[PDB]
Design a protein around this ligand. Structure first.
Ligand code: CA
Length: 369
């Protein structure tokens, strides 16, 4: 059913039923970056101007040493472009401010990135923060990055901030040189496996000829020319214990299950993004996470930025209220007959599926969150 095609980010409110909600004009949103965003800010101006939108108020924050390296990473600009344009589109064309928390590129190990997360939590000005990044959780564990960063996310959750993190682009093969098929050996991405963030997986998005939502399947576009798998990350952490709100997914291990929710991720149904002035059709869970961030920021604006970290409420509300989501039922996030399969209700490729924002907003008005 429906058609697979690229989409302007301004289409995401129509697709996920958010047009009747407020924009995110009253909510400040952050984006974690590696290095600078100078070209990204030019591409953002192109984005708002081409779409006839009011300009976005931005700030860039050097999160580490004042002598650090915050030069633009050229390939990185495409990520910060995807993130910023998808947030602003999904938000209905307005955010209060977009803050770019830039990691120092000349810091030791992963310490630049850790310090970027730290600054966003310390400052506590952004209500929702996008993280379209990740890597094998076992590698993060081995060198202590996991432990250091989980402390920061724990503080964020306690203070009511929502970090949104892409679940991964490697399907179940995150730890096998970042997505090479490995049979029955499955792994997950950090920081998505943290119980202190919302992990956002990936769908293949079909729309009707009139541009309305039609259906979603799992994101899995198979192998590229190098033999690497492109599919939604999903599974469970080998380290993190299950938070109690996930007990509603019976028959799963005592571990943090991910993702929590999912949005559009297939390149073939991806977003049209300005990158160094040129439009490109881009996917990944790097796309799905900023869609969530923009939509969630609308719900914050509708609720005076008073909604806390929403994981427990998503699990209780969605398990009891299937109308709040588009339940993905078809596809798998592996290769060669391996990987997890989607199915009725929560599944490992897609978690609960995508949010129907107007229905979720009505739920929140009635029940709180
Ligand atoms: Ca499902």
């Amino acid at each position: 059913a429906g058609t697979a095609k690229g989409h302007n980010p301004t289409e995401f409110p129509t697709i996920y039923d958010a047009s009747s909600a407020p924009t995110a004009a009253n909510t400040t949103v952050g984006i974690i970056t590696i290095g600078g965003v100078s070209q990204t800010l030019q591409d953002l101006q192109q984005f708002t101007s081409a779409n006839g939108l009011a300009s976005v108020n931005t700030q860039t924050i050097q999160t580490g040493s004042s002598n650090g390296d915050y030069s633009d990473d050229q390939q990185g600009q495409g990520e910060w472009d995807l993130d910023s344009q998808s947030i602003v589109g999904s938000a209905g064309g307005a955010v209060q401010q977009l803050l770019f928390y830039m990691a120092d590129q000349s810091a030791s190990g992963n310490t630049g990135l850790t310090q970027a997360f730290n600054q966003a939590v310390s400052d506590n000005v952004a209500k929702v923060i996008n993280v379209s990044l990740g890597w094998c959780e076992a590698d993060a564990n081995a060198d202590g990055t996991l432990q250091a960063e989980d402390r920061i996310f724990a503080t964020a959750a306690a203070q009511g901030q929502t970090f949104s993190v892409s679940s991964g682009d490697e399907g179940v093969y995150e730890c096998n040189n970042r997505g090479y098929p490995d049979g029955s050996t499955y792994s997950v991405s950090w920081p998505a496996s943290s119980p202190n963030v919302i992990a956002v997986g990936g769908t293949t998005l079909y729309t009707t000829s009139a541009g309305a939502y039609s259906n979603e399947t799992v994101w899995n576009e198979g192998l590229d020319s190098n033999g690497k798998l492109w599919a939604t990350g999903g599974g469970y952490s080998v380290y993190e214990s299950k938070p109690s709100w996930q007990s509603v997914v019976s028959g799963t291990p005592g571990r943090r299950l991910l993702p929590d929710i999912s949005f559009d991720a297939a390149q073939g149904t991806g977003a049209l993004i300005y990158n160094y002035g040129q439009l490109q059709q881009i996917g990944g869970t790097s796309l799905a996470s900023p869609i969530f961030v923009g939509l969630w920021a609308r719900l914050q604006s509708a609720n005076s930025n008073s909604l806390g970290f929403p994981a427990a409420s998503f699990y209780s509300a969605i398990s009891s209220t299937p109308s709040l989501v588009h339940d993905v039922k078809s596809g798998n996030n592996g290769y060669g007959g391996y990987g997890y399969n989607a199915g009725t209700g929560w599944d490992y490729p897609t978690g609960w599926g995508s949010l129907d924002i107007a229905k979720l907003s009505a739920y929140i008005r009635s029940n709180g969150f």
